[PDB]
């Protein structure tokens, strides 16, 4: 009968699973790597990749 | 050859790369050092700084 306090739980774990999971979207760039896009490519459009 | 305004020969080359998910075969010309273990070290295996 213990769902309560295992629903505060769950929440919390599931948010941080799905902020750490975020850092994989591409947000409109080419990459999701910085290191990859500053390797390719120069500073004038790295800027706003 | 009375064509003296007509353009000139444009010959065209084109590549195509960046998979990175194979193991490399056209690499670049960069000397290669010895590995270093157990340290916070910089490395920079087959392009994966």
Request: avoid cysteine; proline fraction near 0%.
């Given at each position: 009968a213990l769902g309560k306090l295992q629903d505060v739980v769950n929440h919390n774990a599931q948010a941080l699973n799905t902020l750490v999971k975020?850092?994989?979207?591409?947000f409109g760039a080419i990459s999701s790597v910085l290191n990859d896009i500053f390797s390719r490519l120069d500073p004038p459009e790295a800027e706003v990749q | 050859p009375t064509y003296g305004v007509g353009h000139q020969p444009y010959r065209v080359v084109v590549l195509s790369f960046?998979?990175?998910?194979?193991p490399a075969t056209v690499c670049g010309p960069k000397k290669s050092t010895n590995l270093v273990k157990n340290k916070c070290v910089n490395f920079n295996f087959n392009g994966l700084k």
């Open positions: 975020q850092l994989s979207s591409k | 960046e998979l990175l998910h194979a």
